[PDB]
Amino acid sequence: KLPAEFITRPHPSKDHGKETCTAYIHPNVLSSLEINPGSFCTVGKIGENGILVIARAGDEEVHPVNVITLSTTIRSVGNLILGDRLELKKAQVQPPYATKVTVGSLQGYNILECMEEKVIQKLLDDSGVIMPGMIFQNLKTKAGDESIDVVITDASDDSLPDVSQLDLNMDDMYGGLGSTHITFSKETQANRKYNLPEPLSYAAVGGLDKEIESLKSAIEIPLHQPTLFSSFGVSPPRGILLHGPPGTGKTMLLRVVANTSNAHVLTINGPSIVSKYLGETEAALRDIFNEARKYQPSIIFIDEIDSIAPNRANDDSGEVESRVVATLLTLMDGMGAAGKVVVIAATNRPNSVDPALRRPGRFDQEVEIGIPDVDARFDILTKQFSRMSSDRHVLDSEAIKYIASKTHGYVGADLTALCRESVMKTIQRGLGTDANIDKFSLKVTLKDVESAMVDIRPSAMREIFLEMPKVYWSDIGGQEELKTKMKEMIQLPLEASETFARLGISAPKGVLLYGPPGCSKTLTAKALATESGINFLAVKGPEIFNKYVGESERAIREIFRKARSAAPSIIFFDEIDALSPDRDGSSTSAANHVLTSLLNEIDGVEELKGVVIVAATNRPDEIDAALLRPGRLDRHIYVGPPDVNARLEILKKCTKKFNTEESGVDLHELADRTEGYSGAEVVLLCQEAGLAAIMEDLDVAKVELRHFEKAFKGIARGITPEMLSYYEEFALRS
Amino acid sequence: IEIPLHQPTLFSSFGVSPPRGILLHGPPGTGKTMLLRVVANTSNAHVLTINGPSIVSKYLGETEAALRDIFNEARKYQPSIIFIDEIDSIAPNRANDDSGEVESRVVATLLTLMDGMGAAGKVVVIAATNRPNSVDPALRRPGRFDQEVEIGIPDVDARFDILTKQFSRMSSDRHVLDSEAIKYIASKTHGYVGADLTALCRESVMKTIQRGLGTDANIDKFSLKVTLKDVESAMVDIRPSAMREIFLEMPKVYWSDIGG
């Protein structure tokens, strides 16, 4: 009596029953709306007018008023998720007549003629039947079993009222155990012209597998098999935390688990629950938890837990505050013993979440969703293009790989936005040039994608997870001794952890790279990342410095936690000659605090086995003796200027584009004359020599020796023997 | 908990106002409220649990009436136990924050209630808090909370004992580990607390669920039980939060390692 809102529940007892028009609503509500039992009922689900015209019936006086049942077929057709709010309404005009109907054979190769066996009678024998959406189980179809479903979205009938979402009609068939101009034609999927909300499948998300299988296991073990875990007596966890940069797709995980799960779920509206009355929010939360526990399979979804649950230490806002945190933890600690209940909470930043929620008592299980790497970006672009299809755009694998390589610091949302505004750029180009031609002819190419990266205005530039592009050995021309040394250093831990454990030697976990400001000490990290195939943490020196006091400590602790959590890896520092000096040069107390924290983290009380830390510096004396202590950063590499062979290889690679035979240079006398330079200096010399070659008559097929020698006058090495002697003296004392 | 409640006449002979409040303070996750449950279960006396901010209402006098009633039925029956939890929000520091509304007036009423009619009686109040200085010094007085109980981070021996206890309760039909493995785990778990150890056990069980499913193709867990391989992982992925403490029991080495 006097109803306000309704909730959904699948029709039990399976089989057939009604399967379309169950509608087990309490008779009081039926008499309240003055609706004929032998007439259609309409439920709107808070919006989306059309109100889902479906016939109704009466219950057995046991079904409570709040909950209603409207069949799994309609549940899947309308993308109805168990827990959404539903609102009833008066029925509209009667549906006239159905014209064509046509099956689609979803997720299958069709060819059902052998297994057809007159499915038309079974499909259209049901009462009601709103044509564009039906979905039924495979049931039993002769031999072979298997699972088959069809798509019935396509239609050609016209309806005067545009209010109705799926424009149902009337069915009049003739059969036993005559149609309308057959139904079987083509294997089309859901038609786009109806703009229906399609369900989200796990195939939509790409490049996020490694944690998505873990999340699937963690959400399936409490629900599907609660008794197996409860037999141990430790009880299954109830809280799963999803964290990461914005746009990674936590909302996607929430939506896809809501869609793929046949059990009831409960979602929150966030700030909407917050009200002026202190007790109103408490009562709403208690009612939500009571509803969740009443239905034995339940799942709780929380959006923006940080806003709902801010930190007490950071801000004492008052009113709606950690009181709700205390009541939530009290309710969720002893809501049930075994049950099957899992709570999923997604936060933008984990640090701002109060430590009460971030305790193993409630949210021990955590899921880390970082920014996509090159492989994940390639996977999402390959998946992203598939949705558009080859008809809408001609893109090959090489273009996808090039885009993934170019797009380094881009979030998943940024990629989809780039695709959308690439389509926009295509529309403007077509309208401007072809004078309103069909948009399918121009389709999508790389020309608009280039301008897309040009004007995308990215938002993920500032991050501590910068990964340099993969660079192979052939690019780097250096000394074989240093390469052998670093190969041994990287090969010791990965395939000798057991040997270290048996012997007790462990690993030095510290390598110092000091040398002239030339080359071979920065791109060697990229070469190492390419060769080893292990994720690297390319963290620049000055970027960790922040105006706010303690922000650098937060960043370094977060990066250490990520390195520990991201398997045995290697962390590379671009420069350390700026943070390390505290006594030689005047520095703030923040720098000293950060240095002390780094010293305590590297080998202070806590020793890390899997991770390996390598430090590169441009000036060695800036590292204090506290950091330059035996047991840490013991290895020292001179990594001086490149030798004759290294410079020759660099020059050969630089001149590979040009023609050496036409120029007549043997690539040896140039290296003999270019001995005091560096690899980067050689690259710049070749660049300016090519510029001098091309400024004469635009494009040229070769660079001449006269241009080489003129550029040799033009440029200077800029390196003095005094700094080399100083580096040698430092190497002697080490 | 025994001497005041069970034998109040021994103190009433002295007649010097026996203590009523017992302070249970320490790091979070040390096992406080679960230990309190044991004191409630093993005692046949009445108990009373205060939800804290849930009891707090918008009306100024509603909380006063409800809590005065709570005390009325507490003292109506002679054998009674009083449990107070999350006193930090219940009794914030007056000087730290002058929030108003529900404020130190509640604290003053509690003081004048517990110090008002209790001469000998038989009444005990259990106080549980995370960081003691959040409770105002008025309650942290020999007049109100003279009794202090120190609960801290477990050491090597306590961690070994609790691990042996959890595994013993869990039974050996589900795991195979000897005393030296437990000792090694306790030594490795330098900075963890009992909640962290329970999380380690649960994550080790989960690691088994992941490994057991994805590898042996839905093989029986029994013929799989619990090893240290998954356990060793669990402690890596537990993401410790009990690293930052002033108290630190750094490792031990015998005289054999002493070179001097």
Ligand SMILES: Nc1ncnc2c1ncn2[C@@H]1O[C@H](COP(=O)(O)OP(=O)(O)O)[C@@H](O)[C@H]1O
């Ligand atoms: N052969 C090469 N071709 C192109 N770039 C190079 C080559 N060798 C080195 N570089 C670049 O020059 C940079 C050298 O950095 P470097 O000046 O040593 O750092 P710092 O200023 O801290 O000393 C590296 O980042 C690398 O990318």
